[PDB]
């Protein structure tokens, strides 16, 4: 029981990526309506992915996680 | 979880839940710890029923003796698409 | 003993969420059936800022689209 | 602010003899109007020295070539008299205000604002040395970070006026220190262009 | 509230219009605005009922400018942003409805 070697963090995952070895099974062709949430989710998820620095230069700090509630 | 797995190697499977009122319970957990035990097991079902895990040749037949006991997320269509009553 | 197992996992989530911040990732997406399973600290901003509702009510133009996509 | 580089743009065009005949005569018109209206008087004397061997010269107190290809060039004695008068006047006025700002404590913001107006007048007549001196007293009174960045860049522009690139380069080192102290994105665009 | 148990009681009012400008000014130091925008003008476009309103007005203008994809925040974003919070404030008190389902 000694520290004799280290592992990289990539391996020893709980579960591997489920977005490159799997691909979503639903697209925005199921989405017609639900546009009200669509303006809020393209701000929340997509904008930090395409570029995080958009927020930073304006001087708005980024929003955190997303909670979806409802039946 | 592992019962659904069985269902995907075995052909056209049919899952009969018999007389379910046990985990039919609602959110409660102001009572005893048993009500969160129900909760843990219930969340497990939803992720299976709909998600990236989708069925098609795995079918659910759910048998109950009163359906207004249940939680309404177990009354949810497209997991339960037909609601057949036998009078 | 059984409840203290539930909680010990949730603490790590909160703590890993603090570490997760100021990163180009999108902080966690999560959903809940109901809004009475939340804890005061989980809902608090800095862990969860955004609260994207989903209404059943929707308006006349949106029921049209949603019938229309499934057709 | 505005005549300081636009007169110099047209004046460079006028200096050349390797430009088109028509382009030189069009630019000469802009320069000459702005000397008499804006009181560019000292820089105008400087400008007679910037041709020499190139043509156009038609001045009354400064050298001429044997070929004048331009006649929108003229020295008049009124320019020189005006210089003497206007100079005294502007200096006298704000001087008094600076003393007034001493007597009743208002001198942190206002006296620096008075001295900025001084460097602009000194910049207007074409003195890099003395415009910089008055913009140096603006720094000493404690003012906003934004104001401090603005002033350094004005001093650096006086380097373009005489077309001395070293003079620009030296001042723009100092603004690199201040730019993150103020932290503006607004005066950082200015910096991008100033350096551009 | 019985005798001698409570001895100082601090009531808090909703914000003034001078106080509501003062909260707006703190928020503007996080952002990059354009010069010539008065935050006493903004505090008068608002009327608020809590110190809560003024924080969503500042965020909205920067999500509007995020959509714009310009670094500056312009004075028109505040016409819209003031309108969104004041609109959101009336939509939880017509049937009194919660911030949840």
Asked if B72 reaches chain A (Cβ–Cβ under 8 Å), the answer is: yes
Q: CA torsion sign, E84 to E85 to E86 to E87?
A: positive
> In whole angstroms, what is the distance from residue A51 CA to residue A56 CA?
10
| C-beta atoms of B33 and C3 within 8 A | yes
CA distance A13 to A11: 5
Distance in angstroms (rounded) separating the CA atoms of residues C25 and A49: 7
And the tokens for D28? Answer: 């000469």
- Locate the domains of chain D by residue range: 2-196
- Write out chain A residues lying below 8 Å of C68, CB-based: 32
Which residue in the set B33, B36, B73 is minimally distant from C33, CB to CB? Answer: B73
Interchain contact D192–E (C-beta under 8 A):
no
Label residue A63 exposed, middle or buried (CB < 10 Å: 0-12, 13-18, 19+). buried
Beta bridge partners of A66: C29, C50
List all residues 6 or more positions away from D111 whose beta carbon is below 8 Å from its beta carbon: D98, D101, D102, D137, D141
Residue D69: closest CA among D128, D28, D110, D116: D28
Token output for A21: 């070895």
Query: Nearest C-alpha of chain C: how many angstroms from E101?
Result: 7
Resolution of this deposited model, Å: 6.3
Q: Per DSSP, what are the bridge partners of residue B62?
A: B17
Residue D188's alpha-carbon distances to B23, D23, D116, E25, in angstroms, are 63, 35, 21, 22
- D18, D101, D123, D148 from D116: Cα distances, Å: 39, 15, 10, 11
Enclosing H/E stretch for E60: helix E53-68
> CB-based contact (8 Å) between D185 and chain E?
yes
Beta bridge partners of C51: A67
Is E50 near chain D, with CB under 8 Å?
no
Cα(B23)–Cα(A57) distance, integer angstroms: 51
Nearest CA in chain E to A39: E67
Contact call for residues C13 and C30 (beta carbons, < 8 A) = no
Q: Which of E61, E51, E55, E60 is nearest to E16 (CA)?
A: E51
CB atoms within 10 A of CB D143: 18
Contact assessment for residue E77 and residue E58, using Cβ atoms and an 8 Å cutoff: no
Partnered with residue E33 across adjacent β-strands are: E73
Which residues of E are less than 8 Å from C51 in CB distance? 99-100
- CA D62-D68-D74 angle, to 5 degrees, is 45
Location of structure tokens 């901003």: C45
Question: Does the CA dihedral D32-D34-D38-D41 come out positive or negative?
Answer: negative
What is the rounded CA–CA span in Å between residue C32 and residue E100? Answer: 12
Q: Which residues of C touch E101 (CB under 8 A)?
A: 35, 53-55
Q: Residues B48, B1: contact at Cβ < 8 Å? A: yes
Nearest residue in C to E100, CA atom: C35
Q: Establish if C55 touches chain E: CB-CB under 8 angstroms.
A: yes
DSSP string, A17-57: -SSSSS--S--TTT-SS-HHHHHHHIIIIIHHHH-THHHHH
Distance of CA B72 to the CA centre of its chain: 11
DSSP one-letter string for E5-33: T-------PPP-HHHHHHHHHHHHTTS-B
The coordinates were experimentally obtained by cryo-EM
Interface test with A, best of B1, B26, B52 (most A CBs within 10 A): B52
Give the whole-angstrom CA distance, residue D16 versus residue B73: 85
Among E25, E99, E34, residue whose Cα is nearest residue E55: E25
Question: Cα torsion for B33, B38, B44, B50, to the nearest 10°?
Answer: -140
> Are C and B neighbours with ≥3 CB pairs closer than 8 A?
yes
Could you give the CA distance from residue D3 to residue D9 in angstroms, rounded to a whole number?
10
B36 touches C at CB < 8 Å: yes
- B75's CB contacts (< 8 A; 6+ apart) are B67
Lookup: tokens for D80: 């020189």
Distance in angstroms (rounded) separating the CA atoms of residues D150 and D133: 15
């Amino acid at each position: 029981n000694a520290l004799v070697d280290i592992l990289p963090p990539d391996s020893d995952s709980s579960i591997s990526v489920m977005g490159e070895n799997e691909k979503p099974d639903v697209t925005y062709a199921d989405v017609g309506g639900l546009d009200m949430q669509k303006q809020e989710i393209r701000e929340a998820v997509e904008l930090p992915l395409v570029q995080a620095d958009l927020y930073e230069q304006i001087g708005i700090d980024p929003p955190r996680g997303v909670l979806l509630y409802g039946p | 979880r592992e019962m659904f797995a069985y269902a995907k190697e075995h052909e056209p499977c049919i899952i009969f839940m018999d007389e379910v009122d046990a985990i039919g319970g609602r959110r409660f957990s102001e009572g005893t710890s048993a009500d969160r035990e129900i909760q843990r097991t219930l969340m497990e079902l939803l992720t299976q029923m709909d998600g990236f895990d989708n069925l098609g040749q795995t079918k659910i037949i759910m048998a109950t003796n009163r359906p207004d006991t249940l939680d309404p997320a177990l009354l949810r269509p497209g997991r339960l698409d037909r609601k057949v009553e036998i009078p | 003993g059984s409840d203290r197992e539930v909680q010990r996992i949730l603490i790590e989530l909160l703590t890993q969420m603090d570490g997760f911040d100021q990163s180009t990732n999108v902080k966690v997406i999560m959903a809940t059936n109901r809004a009475d399973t939340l804890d005061p600290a989980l809902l608090r901003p800095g862990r969860l800022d955004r609260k994207i509702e989903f209404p059943s009510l929707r308006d006349r133009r949106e029921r049209r689209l949603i019938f229309g996509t499934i057709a | 602010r505005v005549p300081n580089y636009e007169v110099s743009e047209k004046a460079f065009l006028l200096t050349q003899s390797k430009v088109s005949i028509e382009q030189r005569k069009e630019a000469a018109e802009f320069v000459l109007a702005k000397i008499k209206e804006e009181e560019m008087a000292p820089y105008y004397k400087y400008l007679c020295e910037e041709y020499l061997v190139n043509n156009g010269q038609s001045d009354l107190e400064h050298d001429e070539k044997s070929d004048s290809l331009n006649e929108w060039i003229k020295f008049d004695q009124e320019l020189y008299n005006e210089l003497c008068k206007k100079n005294e006047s502007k200096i006298k006025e704000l001087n008094e205000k600076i003393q007034k700002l001493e007597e009743d404590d208002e001198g942190e913001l206002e006296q620096a604002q008075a001295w900025i107006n001084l460097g602009e007048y000194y910049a207007q007549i074409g003195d890099k040395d003395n415009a910089e001196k008055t913009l140096g007293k603006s720094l000493s009174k404690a003012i906003s970070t934004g104001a401090k960045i603005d002033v350094m860049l004005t001093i650096a522009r006086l380097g373009f006026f005489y077309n001395d690139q070293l003079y620009v380069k030296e001042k723009l080192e100092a603004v690199n220190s201040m730019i993150e102290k103020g932290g503006d994105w607004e005066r950082r665009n200015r910096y991008k262009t100033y350096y551009g | 509230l019985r005798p001698g148990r409570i001895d100082r009681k601090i009531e808090f009012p909703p914000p003034s219009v001078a106080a509501r400008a003062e909260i707006l000014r703190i928020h503007s130091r996080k952002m990059n605005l354009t010069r010539g925008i008065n935050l006493r003008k903004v505090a008068e476009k608002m009327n608020g009922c809590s110190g809560a309103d003024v924080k969503g007005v500042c965020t909205e203008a920067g999500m509007y400018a995020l959509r714009e994809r310009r670094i500056h925040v312009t004075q028109e974003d505040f016409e819209l942003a003031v309108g969104k919070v004041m609109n959101k404030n009336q939509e939880t008190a017509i049937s009194v409805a919660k911030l949840f389902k």
